[PDB]
Design an enzyme around this catalytic site. Sequence first.
Site, PDB file in Angstrom:
ATOM      1  N   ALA A  90       5.413  10.568   3.268  1.00  0.00           N
ATOM      2  CA  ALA A  90       6.375   9.488   3.123  1.00  0.00           C
ATOM      3  C   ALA A  90       7.334   9.576   4.295  1.00  0.00           C
ATOM      4  O   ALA A  90       8.370  10.244   4.239  1.00  0.00           O
ATOM      5  CB  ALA A  90       7.107   9.598   1.790  1.00  0.00           C
ATOM      6  N   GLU A  93      -9.283   7.360   9.271  1.00  0.00           N
ATOM      7  CA  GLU A  93     -10.338   6.878   8.389  1.00  0.00           C
ATOM      8  C   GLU A  93     -11.692   6.823   9.095  1.00  0.00           C
ATOM      9  O   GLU A  93     -12.736   7.089   8.468  1.00  0.00           O
ATOM     10  CB  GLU A  93      -9.976   5.503   7.827  1.00  0.00           C
ATOM     11  CG  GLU A  93     -11.007   4.892   6.893  1.00  0.00           C
ATOM     12  CD  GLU A  93     -10.467   3.636   6.250  1.00  0.00           C
ATOM     13  OE1 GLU A  93     -10.726   2.522   6.791  1.00  0.00           O
ATOM     14  OE2 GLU A  93      -9.760   3.765   5.224  1.00  0.00           O
TER      15      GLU A  93
HETATM   16  C1  LIG Z   1      -4.754  -8.738   3.840  1.00  0.00           C
HETATM   17  C2  LIG Z   1      -5.339  -7.390   4.298  1.00  0.00           C
HETATM   18  C3  LIG Z   1      -6.868  -7.401   4.282  1.00  0.00           C
HETATM   19  C4  LIG Z   1      -7.444  -5.965   4.266  1.00  0.00           C
HETATM   20  C5  LIG Z   1      -8.898  -5.942   3.785  1.00  0.00           C
HETATM   21  C6  LIG Z   1      -9.665  -4.694   4.236  1.00  0.00           C
HETATM   22  O1  LIG Z   1      -8.890  -3.513   3.932  1.00  0.00           O
HETATM   23  C7  LIG Z   1      -8.638  -2.782   5.119  1.00  0.00           C
HETATM   24  O2  LIG Z   1      -9.882  -2.219   5.508  1.00  0.00           O
HETATM   25  C8  LIG Z   1      -9.772  -1.561   6.753  1.00  0.00           C
HETATM   26  C9  LIG Z   1     -11.207  -1.150   7.116  1.00  0.00           C
HETATM   27  O3  LIG Z   1     -11.961  -2.294   7.533  1.00  0.00           O
HETATM   28  C10 LIG Z   1      -8.841  -0.346   6.562  1.00  0.00           C
HETATM   29  O4  LIG Z   1      -9.386   0.600   5.619  1.00  0.00           O
HETATM   30  C11 LIG Z   1      -7.484  -0.826   6.059  1.00  0.00           C
HETATM   31  O5  LIG Z   1      -6.678   0.315   5.730  1.00  0.00           O
HETATM   32  C12 LIG Z   1      -7.679  -1.675   4.793  1.00  0.00           C
HETATM   33  O6  LIG Z   1      -6.418  -2.364   4.473  1.00  0.00           O
HETATM   34  C13 LIG Z   1      -5.651  -1.677   3.467  1.00  0.00           C
HETATM   35  O7  LIG Z   1      -6.407  -1.560   2.216  1.00  0.00           O
HETATM   36  C14 LIG Z   1      -6.710  -2.821   1.564  1.00  0.00           C
HETATM   37  C15 LIG Z   1      -7.418  -2.453   0.257  1.00  0.00           C
HETATM   38  C16 LIG Z   1      -5.387  -3.582   1.313  1.00  0.00           C
HETATM   39  O8  LIG Z   1      -4.543  -2.898   0.354  1.00  0.00           O
HETATM   40  C17 LIG Z   1      -4.597  -3.779   2.614  1.00  0.00           C
HETATM   41  O9  LIG Z   1      -3.355  -4.467   2.336  1.00  0.00           O
HETATM   42  C18 LIG Z   1      -4.315  -2.415   3.261  1.00  0.00           C
HETATM   43  O10 LIG Z   1      -3.666  -2.607   4.523  1.00  0.00           O
HETATM   44  O1  LIG Z   2       5.476   4.486   8.639  1.00  0.00           O
HETATM   45  C1  LIG Z   2       4.602   5.098   7.958  1.00  0.00           C
HETATM   46  C2  LIG Z   2       3.255   4.751   8.069  1.00  0.00           C
HETATM   47  C3  LIG Z   2       2.313   5.448   7.305  1.00  0.00           C
HETATM   48  N1  LIG Z   2       2.707   6.439   6.470  1.00  0.00           N
HETATM   49  C4  LIG Z   2       1.788   7.230   5.629  1.00  0.00           C
HETATM   50  O2  LIG Z   2       0.432   6.968   6.009  1.00  0.00           O
HETATM   51  C5  LIG Z   2      -0.271   6.330   4.926  1.00  0.00           C
HETATM   52  C6  LIG Z   2      -1.294   5.335   5.478  1.00  0.00           C
HETATM   53  O3  LIG Z   2      -0.603   4.191   5.977  1.00  0.00           O
HETATM   54  P1  LIG Z   2      -0.698   2.779   5.273  1.00  0.00           P
HETATM   55  O4  LIG Z   2      -0.567   2.996   3.782  1.00  0.00           O
HETATM   56  O5  LIG Z   2       0.267   1.854   5.983  1.00  0.00           O
HETATM   57  O6  LIG Z   2      -2.210   2.338   5.641  1.00  0.00           O
HETATM   58  P2  LIG Z   2      -3.119   1.245   4.911  1.00  0.00           P
HETATM   59  O7  LIG Z   2      -2.970   1.305   3.416  1.00  0.00           O
HETATM   60  O8  LIG Z   2      -2.798  -0.082   5.540  1.00  0.00           O
HETATM   61  O9  LIG Z   2      -4.482   1.826   5.316  1.00  0.00           O
HETATM   62  C7  LIG Z   2       0.846   5.744   4.055  1.00  0.00           C
HETATM   63  O10 LIG Z   2       0.459   5.510   2.692  1.00  0.00           O
HETATM   64  C8  LIG Z   2       1.875   6.832   4.160  1.00  0.00           C
HETATM   65  O11 LIG Z   2       1.500   7.928   3.309  1.00  0.00           O
HETATM   66  C9  LIG Z   2       4.070   6.765   6.379  1.00  0.00           C
HETATM   67  O12 LIG Z   2       4.409   7.692   5.601  1.00  0.00           O
HETATM   68  N2  LIG Z   2       4.963   6.096   7.123  1.00  0.00           N
END
Ligand SMILES: CCCCCCO[C@@H]1O[C@H](CO)[C@H](O)[C@H](O)[C@H]1O[C@@H]1O[C@@H](C)[C@@H](O)[C@@H](O)[C@@H]1O
Ligand SMILES: O=c1ccn([C@@H]2O[C@H](COP(=O)(O)OP(=O)(O)O)[C@@H](O)[C@H]2O)c(=O)[nH]1
EC number: 2.4.1.40
Lengths: 277, 277
Positions: free
Chosen positions: B61, B234
């Site tokens: 966090a 990832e």
């Molecule tokens: C309007 C956003 C559209 C996102 C759809 C696809 O997902 C994204 O997939 C990517 C891989 O290709 C990454 O794993 C992103 O973290 C994921 O977006 C994340 O996880 C998703 C489940 C959502 O919660 C999204 O908001 C978040 O940023």
């Molecule tokens: O400013 C930030 C950005 C990322 N994170 C950490 O990194 C994780 C992955 O980032 P985020 O959830 O934005 O990614 P997404 O869900 O879009 O893959 C977050 O849940 C946090 O645990 C954080 O602590 N501060």
Amino acid sequence: FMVSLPRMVYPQPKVLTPCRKDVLVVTPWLAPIVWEGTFNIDILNEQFRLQNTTIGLTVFAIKKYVAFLKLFLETAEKHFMVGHRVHYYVFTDQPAAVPRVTLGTGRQLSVLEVGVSMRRMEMISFCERRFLSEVDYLVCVDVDMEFRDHVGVEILTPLFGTLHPSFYGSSREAFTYERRPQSQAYIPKDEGDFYYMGAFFGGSVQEVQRLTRACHQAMMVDQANGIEAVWHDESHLNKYLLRHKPTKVLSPEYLWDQQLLGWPAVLRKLRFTAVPK
Amino acid sequence: FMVSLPRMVYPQPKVLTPCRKDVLVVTPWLAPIVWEGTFNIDILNEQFRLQNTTIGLTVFAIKKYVAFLKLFLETAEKHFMVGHRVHYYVFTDQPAAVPRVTLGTGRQLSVLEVGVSMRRMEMISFCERRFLSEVDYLVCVDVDMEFRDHVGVEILTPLFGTLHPSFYGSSREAFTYERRPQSQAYIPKDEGDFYYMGAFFGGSVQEVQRLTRACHQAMMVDQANGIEAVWHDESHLNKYLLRHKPTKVLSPEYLWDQQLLGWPAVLRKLRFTAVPK
Ligand SMILES: CCCCCCO[C@@H]1O[C@H](CO)[C@H](O)[C@H](O)[C@H]1O[C@@H]1O[C@@H](C)[C@@H](O)[C@@H](O)[C@@H]1O
Ligand SMILES: O=c1ccn([C@@H]2O[C@H](COP(=O)(O)OP(=O)(O)O)[C@@H](O)[C@H]2O)c(=O)[nH]1
Ligand SMILES: CCCCCCO[C@@H]1O[C@H](CO)[C@H](O)[C@H](O)[C@H]1O[C@@H]1O[C@@H](C)[C@@H](O)[C@@H](O)[C@@H]1O
Ligand SMILES: O=c1ccn([C@@H]2O[C@H](COP(=O)(O)OP(=O)(O)O)[C@@H](O)[C@H]2O)c(=O)[nH]1
Ligand SMILES: [Mn+2]
Ligand SMILES: [Mn+2]
């Protein structure tokens, strides 16, 4: 330490497509139940070869049962862990009656002379030191059997049992568990997951030694108390596997009697089968 | 050593009845895929409590994301490993912003102060000694999340990943793997089992340390070569889990976005879900 798998080209598993819809392929404690169509043997072979896995196979051929060894061993050579290291341990009262069987490379056979009910569990649990030094997994099978199809590393896991072919469709109250409370093997009518057959179990050397020690001790207690379990070491094996859940369960593909039970649709392969006696 | 399970009364698993016919519940390398209806949580709870299992949960966090901690931790208390020993490790640049959350008995929280892309894998792989001394399993999750339903010991295994909710029905060529051969995370269009989401993985401490070390080293190589993988850690996690198969895979029950994806029939429970941001 497990090194990386090489690049491999194989069909993608698809989450919204199971191959087997007709059978339970995982237990309620998240142990795989091994059926044809559930595993990619190329991936498993890679994983286990990268660890230079050695599989020990124990088989007892006492008195007249030495007659079963030739077919048992010759078919094991065609079907059992081919490509992997295998050490057969043949326990017998007649070392001279063990047939001369030609083995593939990386495979060895040891004849262990022994001088019924309690012998197998006692003997396996004493070869303790030898097995720990020589093999990674132990597989313990009946000799009155033949391999008809692949039996490979898909079975390997810390502890496995095999579904008895007569009971895989039965309700637990019909299982022929020991039902007398005076026996260490006792299982009440409202307990039991599966009826495992005593003719095929195994696991890591450590877990097999634990199982066989426990069953041997429980059989000795029963003997001291003047009771013999209804299905002998199989009753004890069932009690053990109820209280210590196996980490894989083999389907009846792995222990079948075609003369008695035919070839049901649910069996895509008959791998290890009873020889008429 | 694993002591015996006590007597338990529960429904018999029936081999010729699967509960889940609609989804793949085992991978081709014989790893369970964890869906509701596949496990008896009473059996699993017994098994893991008998080992006095301690689960560590890591969560980062940093900067504005400290705002997500209160709901994350309060819902973890309602749903995450309840009845088991839990140690939360909260990594943050603002220790004073960590909310005071009341914990159930047997549960502890440690605030670890840190000074983006590479931080999490680097940090987890250095807390190495601490984790080995304090917990049996490590679970590594995103903070921008809440628990809505049970997440328990059914997930625990040497190494697990979680199916990304946007890709569980996709063909592998559609997976957003890193596709540039210049990256350590590169996966060609004909490889891949699943697309795992970076927001929920775990395993034994040893296996998690192996994964995070490998991903950190691969990310450092990429940095030295002037390339950043398309989905950062990832992408690397996906490369690792392709070459080192997980021993369980969590279904998308365990990582869901209801705003984005609704509540499909195939999901009987929504357990751990995205908080809108
Ligand atoms: C309007 C956003 C559209 C996102 C759809 C696809 O997902 C994204 O997939 C990517 C891989 O290709 C990454 O794993 C992103 O973290 C994921 O977006 C994340 O996880 C998703 C489940 C959502 O919660 C999204 O908001 C978040 O940023
Ligand atoms: O400013 C930030 C950005 C990322 N994170 C950490 O990194 C994780 C992955 O980032 P985020 O959830 O934005 O990614 P997404 O869900 O879009 O893959 C977050 O849940 C946090 O645990 C954080 O602590 N501060
Ligand atoms: C005409 C014989 C009828 C036997 C049907 C039931 O099976 C027996 O089941 C018992 C448990 O309740 C024991 O496991 C026996 O070992 C098994 O018979 C053994 O395994 C079977 C698969 C057969 O191969 C049988 O010949 C063999 O003695
Ligand atoms: O006289 C005997 C009786 C039994 N066995 C061994 O014990 C196993 C179990 O016995 P059997 O196969 O007769 O039992 P069933 O298949 O009827 O359960 C055999 O396969 C042999 O390995 C043996 O070697 N000699
Ligand atoms: Mn037999
Ligand atoms: Mn997130």
